[PDB]
Amino acid sequence: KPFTLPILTLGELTNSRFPLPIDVLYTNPNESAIVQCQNGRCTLDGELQGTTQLLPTGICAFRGKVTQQVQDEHRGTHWNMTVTNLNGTPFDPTEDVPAPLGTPDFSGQIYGVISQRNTNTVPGEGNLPANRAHEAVIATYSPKFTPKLGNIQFSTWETQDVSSGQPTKFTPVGLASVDANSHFDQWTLPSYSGALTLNMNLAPSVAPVFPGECLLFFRSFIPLKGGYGNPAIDCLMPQEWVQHLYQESAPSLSDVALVRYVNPETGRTLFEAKLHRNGFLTVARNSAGPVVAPTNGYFRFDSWVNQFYTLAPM
Amino acid sequence: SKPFTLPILTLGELTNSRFPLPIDVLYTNPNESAIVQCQNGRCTLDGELQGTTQLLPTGICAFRGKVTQQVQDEHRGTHWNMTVTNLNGTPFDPTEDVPAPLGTPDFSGQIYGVISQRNTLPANRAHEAVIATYSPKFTPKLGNIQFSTWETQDVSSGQPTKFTPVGLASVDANSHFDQWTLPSYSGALTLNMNLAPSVAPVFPGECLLFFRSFIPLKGGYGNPAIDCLMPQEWVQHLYQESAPSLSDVALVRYVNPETGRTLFEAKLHRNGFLTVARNSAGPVVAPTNGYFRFDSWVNQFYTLAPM
């Protein structure tokens, strides 16, 4: 079964690490951090890895139930919630995953909305449940962020109107802050089971192996609740590629596919890249920053090569 | 002839094409009195997007643009006029043969979400916001809409602005939630244009089959839902494949892959919607692992096995 990529321009792609459109292709050869994100991880033959799942609505989302209001030193009102799998089934910590699928894979203050629809209905309102929603922040670096143990903590500006024991949804929107005390680092994994435990069942780190090559990312800019900043989230492959590879499950005929970024109008190749078996791209480039390319461009599979193939310089 | 296919995705692997929500259940309502003519999640079986349908899950009920100024309105809150562009940032051209910018909401109600701004390091702000799509100030086809905030002051004019949808503000009577009532995209007293066609069963005993999602509420009593004709992944798949339609009606089977058994069959119509032979309203209670598989091309006279 021939390997294929979908035919989608950057303007038709979304980020696999946060619910955002892809804005630009991006490189940063001098990156000092280990790149080991857990969302948007899929092998070329269709095996999802890390915390990766298929739903665009599931990325950095949580489902569960608030247990109670809790105490925390930080400003705001704090709440504990148990989390389930996104499909509502109980999360089994013995499963070979780092955390419930969809769990955020970076350190920071994730801003979004907590909403609730009560289980109990009220006769005075046509047997319909009561509802509420409020802005919320989940600090993934907090010792109380323990999704692999089945519960996390979120804060609200709202001081009162969050109900205990009721079905609860977190819809991610952006970051609360990227100032020094908000610990935003897109390549630092949360400690899924708490302070000082080792994460397990991780998708592997990724890196170029050929001299002169660097990782190529699909970059999205992420909204901020407040403060100064222009934060971005870089994924290895867009969510549509994860979805495509999963559907196709085409056998990988080598460890590296040669792909070309093409301008369909001219038919000309804008640059070429290596698409590695574990599900990431490298290019021959010696600079950091956006890849300035025609809007109509997209990657096309060329052939299976090997790790010694020399890419044409971007 | 390139064979027609559907993706292999359980309900738990599908998302709504009319609001950014997971699909919760399959659903029927044979006694529905409204004309079904939604504009998002519209795609022919040979891959032609229609109405306001676009490919991004992040674009559904989203807006991009710039606030012009604070304005006044009868509705509760503080109100803001915003010009809207295409979701890709290019200027929206009202002369294009679309009902409204792609992604524009296709139903009447108070849509709740978050407005965020990043100034042209830049300063930022975000606030809860509501867009009343039934309002005379909801004029996306004219290039501008109005949103309200609880926040009274800190919304900046002339700055890049994003609306991220989250749910509904209310489904009280005065919030005019009706998922089958289209907004007037050019405002009061104007006719919508370039619409995807209405859909309906034509065969006796048949009813539409929907992919249903429950939509969050900011407050109040209710259990509102949004029904789409096909999930967003089907729109994305059909667009990619562009397989020729060999008749007006495809026969599809909802299969349990474990047992291999067919749970029921349905008609998948050329314009991009499903019908089944069912005489009841409510969820289709089916195993979690089930999904639709293309069987064969049939015609309008094919008699579906009763569900």
Ligand SMILES: C[C@@H]1O[C@@H](O[C@@H]2[C@@H](O)[C@H](O)O[C@H](CO)[C@H]2O[C@@H]2O[C@H](CO)[C@H](O)[C@H](O)[C@H]2O)[C@@H](O)[C@H](O)[C@@H]1O
């Ligand atoms: C059902 C209720 O909805 C929300 O409170 C609403 C609020 O959104 C609206 O603006 O004002 C009404 C009051 O007229 C609020 O509804 C009352 O909330 C009470 C509790 O605060 C109580 O439930 C009354 O029966 C409601 O009429 C939510 O904020 C609230 O938690 C609750 O789900």
